[PDB]
Design a protein around this nucleic acid. Sequence first.
RNA 1: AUUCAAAGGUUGUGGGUUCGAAUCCCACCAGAGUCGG
RNA 2: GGGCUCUGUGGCGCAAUGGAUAGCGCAUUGGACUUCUAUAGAGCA
Lengths: 126, 264, 313, 379, 285
Amino acid sequence: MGTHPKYLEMMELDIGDATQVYVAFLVYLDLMESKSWHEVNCVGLPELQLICLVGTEIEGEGLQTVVPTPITASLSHNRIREILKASRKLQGDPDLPMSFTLAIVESDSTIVYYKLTDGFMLPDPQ
Amino acid sequence: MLVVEVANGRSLVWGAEAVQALRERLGVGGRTVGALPRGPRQNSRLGLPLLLMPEEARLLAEIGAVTLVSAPRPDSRHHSLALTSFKRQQEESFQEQSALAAEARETRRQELLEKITEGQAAKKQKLEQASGASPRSALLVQLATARPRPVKARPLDWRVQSKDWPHAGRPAHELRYSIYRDLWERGFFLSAAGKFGGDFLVYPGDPLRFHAHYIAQCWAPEDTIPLQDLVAAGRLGTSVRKTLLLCSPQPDGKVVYTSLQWAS
Amino acid sequence: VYETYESPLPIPFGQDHGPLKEFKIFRAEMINNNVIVRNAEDIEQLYGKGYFGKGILSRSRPSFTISDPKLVAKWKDMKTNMPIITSKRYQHSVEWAAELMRRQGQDESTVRRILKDYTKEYVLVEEQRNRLICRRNPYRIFEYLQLSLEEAFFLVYALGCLSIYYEKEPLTIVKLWKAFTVVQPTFRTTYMAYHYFRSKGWVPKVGLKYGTDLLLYRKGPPFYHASYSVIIELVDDHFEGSLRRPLSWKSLAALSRVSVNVSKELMLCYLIKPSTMTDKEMESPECMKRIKVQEVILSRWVSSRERSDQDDL
Amino acid sequence: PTTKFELERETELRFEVEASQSVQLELLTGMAEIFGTELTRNKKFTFDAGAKVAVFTWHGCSVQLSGRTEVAYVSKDTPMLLYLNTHTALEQMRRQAEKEEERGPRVMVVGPTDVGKSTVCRLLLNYAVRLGRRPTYVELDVGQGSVSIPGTMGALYIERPADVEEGFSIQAPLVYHFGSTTPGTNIKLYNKITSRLADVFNQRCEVNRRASVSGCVINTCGWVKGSGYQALVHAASAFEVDVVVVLDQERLYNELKRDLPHFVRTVLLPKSGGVVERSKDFRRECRDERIREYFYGFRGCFYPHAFNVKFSDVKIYKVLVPVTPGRDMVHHLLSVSTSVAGFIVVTSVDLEHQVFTVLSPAPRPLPKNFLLIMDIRFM
Amino acid sequence: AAVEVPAGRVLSARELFAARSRSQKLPQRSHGPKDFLPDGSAAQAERLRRCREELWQLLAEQRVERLGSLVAAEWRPEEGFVELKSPAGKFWQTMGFSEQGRQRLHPEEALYLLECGSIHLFHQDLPLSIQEAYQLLLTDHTVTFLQYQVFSHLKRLGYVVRRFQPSSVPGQASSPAVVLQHISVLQTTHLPDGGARLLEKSGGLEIIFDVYQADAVATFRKNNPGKPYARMCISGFDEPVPDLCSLKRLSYQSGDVPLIFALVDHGDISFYSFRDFTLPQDVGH
RNA sequence: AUUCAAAGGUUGUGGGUUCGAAUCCCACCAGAGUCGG
RNA sequence: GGGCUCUGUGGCGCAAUGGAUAGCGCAUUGGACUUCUAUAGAGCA
Ligand SMILES: [Mg+2]
Ligand SMILES: [Mg+2]
Ligand SMILES: [Mg+2]
Ligand SMILES: [Mg+2]
Ligand SMILES: [Mg+2]
Ligand SMILES: [Mg+2]
């Protein structure tokens, strides 16, 4: 599958990692086939060296941002804020509060999805 | 104005009006750690004293609502008048309980006197029919919760490290005080979260009637957060219906917040 | 690559023992720090036996049908085989097939005609009425079993049934040790715990969803559910040593709470290594033969429930 | 009682012996065949209880019978020529084996209980050695094994046709261990046994082109349900399968040409009328009788040794763990492993002496301390 | 300067009698299910009002006892104990020690008995309140505040808490040969295996109490108590978790009695228990 | 992520004072400590 | 073995009283969880 168009297009983006690109490919495969998203693309942020997927869960709703991270890495709240600002710069619309989705991927391609927002979110009143 | 007693670096409140003022005016709730005078064989409800965190006591000293003193020590020159006063008070409070005791006893007798007379007459008439057929430990004393004599204490300085305030300068205290003060200014109620794997619990109102909404974790803006820790904390927050907050004070004075929630 | 009576040889490919029944060495390829097997025999043998690895698309096993589950009841009235796909998914495969078409130099007006002849090893698309017609294969999507690092090493080192290829040249458990240690800087402790556990008959799987290091199944995911949730640590035989992740009393309280909610036990594992050991003696796998293991179980003593440990019906 | 039978051409004389009886027959006039062996002029030969004699005649004959017979009569219901047809067809294979530097055909007589496995095996072996051939005989039916005691696997080098009553003379007869009456108790044994003896005669036929050309004859179990057919295909594709002949249950034909390679010629046949019912008691006492004709010999010509064997002399492995000596070892068997040298039977136990007394076909010492004990008992 | 702290509420006779005729049932903490969203007009407000006016009544309650149910005690700070001036009561079956002909109590037992209301503490011919007792008895020389918190928490459930005197004591090789778990080249240790040479680091955590269950209260022999139910280390919640060397040291000190860790988090008690474990090789199917 | 309700009795045994005893008095069992032998 | 002191209340730890209605907690059994994880299981502002 290594010749998949998206794998080589991810290679194209001059990021500088083998971990990040394969993990991004894994999350793309998890989204576009299992979870049935529509029109998922891959943008590179060289300010942070981050290969980040920008997609649409179902056609008609706004864009979402997904940063595929492995478990070996670790973040600081300053880098979290950096990625919040990057995401807002990326999808563009300054109305809704900044937010992205962190996809922690294991070694055997096991993915966990968490959502980071900027501010106070209530537990489950939606 | 209120006064909190700081001994060895821990802050206690011993009055019942100071706790009411604290909670009903300043949004500070504390934690009752004592025993109950009526429930002393149970761990469900506890009474005075009320224990304050160091951050709550520092915030209350700064906004000017309390006065942190150092716990006084007996003067030893005010002892003889103390002794004679205690002796007089004990004697008079003892010999004045006898009067209302006697009155209350006559009252508890005249209320059911008819029953006494009926039973006595039944007793002695059955005795007749058979004849034809044959102080201390009662004196009450009070065990005070808070010292009953006015003393003089010396005000404590919380912006200088000392013996009974070892907190000034420590980094964890500065961090947690930054976040506590920011959250408290926003109108929230706050408590400690050890059993929930966090630093604070954040309520939209008095915790007597509301469930908490957030578990807050104080972080330095450059410390690295281990991912596994984030996953465990998000799972625990999902299990108890609480968002996971991430708080960090920025050099420019303002604190930044970030919510974490499980998605799919 | 030995610790077994069958083929205790590091990387001889010239198999010769004599008195044996039938051993068939498995195959795997290392693509950018991930071991994958691309053969159906290999996949089915590794997963029906011991439950090794995870399917790269599905959740539990490599059983991702590229068919659609909702429309299985659509036309089960007919007699056909597995492939039945809605139109737009094959249209998207045609999108990233015209990707390949333009990337190989063929212009658009000939690409359209060539694939129109290919829209006349192959598939069956579906479509008032909705019918179906046979199509040609848009894109290869064959399954791959993705093996963890510790898993693949336990397979090559401790059993010998697996051979890893890195640019078509097989590896050895000297440089395999080196490579796995240099890509995942904490491969040694995790493989030592994995080896210790799977040698007692248990089945170790990754515990990412709970925040721990491993989960132990009695006989496998489909038969039983996990009982223990393990965290791994390394120390010296004078108990000197750094930590993988430092444990507060908030990490342990949270881990214990979320393990009680899911009916599991929080085991802390320690690996004690001698002080006379050197960072080049521990650069060989056989250092394993001189390191000790110690488990502890962390629990939550409830004050009010243990004041009479005689009362039970 | 003297009875005269006239067996004209293409006819089967069906007769078998009553219990504890004696039967005496002699080819007075003409020629006759016994399961493939042409009986000699006027030879008075004897028949014992339970023995089956379905003698077909090539040229017809005049036969004398003095004695009692359970069943004894003439029958024109005879498929035996179809027998020959198979042979005659495979007779091609015979010389065609050494035509193009190929090796001979090997043939299966497959089918359930009551089919005549050993009958076709009889005739095929005898006719093989009749046309100058020298066939390999592999018998696997551990229920009524005759290559050895039942509960073992065996192989025969057929030097000349079998005699009238007793049969092919055992000279270096291949024996290997199974231990139990039925392969339903352990299949792995039958598996590696099949492979073992198959490659064994691989080596023998490549170093003795004799049987390579002359092909081989096999006897397999009469199992048709469970792993019987799976082991049947295992054996066939291991035994260089050339031709397989099904015995009068065409269910075997269907699944047999459904699970063999295309190269395999599957030929079905209805069994002869001479296949008689033999229930539990039959093979019961015929198994104990095979033990008897191992250890005491036909007509009592074997005189075995009855005395002690040391526990400090021998170690046994039980099919994998050696069994601690316990009094469960009485009247079991013991196999001397080299292949196998021979077999012995236990009679009594000595605890504080630590020796158990055995009966032996050869004297002391036993050529190996390698022994494998039985699962079935005989005393 | 010097601020003058006001102090104390003195119950009058008429209120001492009223506090004698007190009930026993605790008020309910929340009156039904707590809420989730503070947006409201008058139900939430009145519910909070009632839930508060009940709290300010509970905390404004003083202890009132009889002068005969009260043992008279004295606080010797130089020798460092409490001396009873009268024969003790039912607490003397599990608490105290008799030396030189007199009955004596450790400072934490004395403070807990003052809180329950069984004794009457004096110091220099003057009785001590609970604030003064908290300040005098809870130094670093006698007993700390967290240790007293754990002590009283346990003692209010029924346990026997004594001081710990150190002088107290399958896979795809489709080979039909399975024994082959010989792969085990990783030896298992235990917790007390090598704790007698680790005690050289006699610093850090320490055992503080022995704990006997509540079934042992009716037939407790202070002179010959037996083997305890647990031993207790008392730490704080913000403190470092104990290492493996400290765990081995404490598990060798304790013996074969289990060892529990009590953590106090700004007034909230929690108990954990490390225990050495031996995974059962048995998994045979 | 907690919150509410119900059920549960030889007041060691016997006697006495009393209109009325878990309550006050005596005796007798069972237990703990101390003095000591 | 003798003297002196103290104790005995619901399965367990305990209240109560001039002497005038034997109830609190833990454990147990049931409900609601605006609860969660999934017929369960777990519930520590
Ligand atoms: Mg609760
Ligand atoms: Mg009485
Ligand atoms: Mg009582
Ligand atoms: Mg009772
Ligand atoms: Mg009781
Ligand atoms: Mg009453």
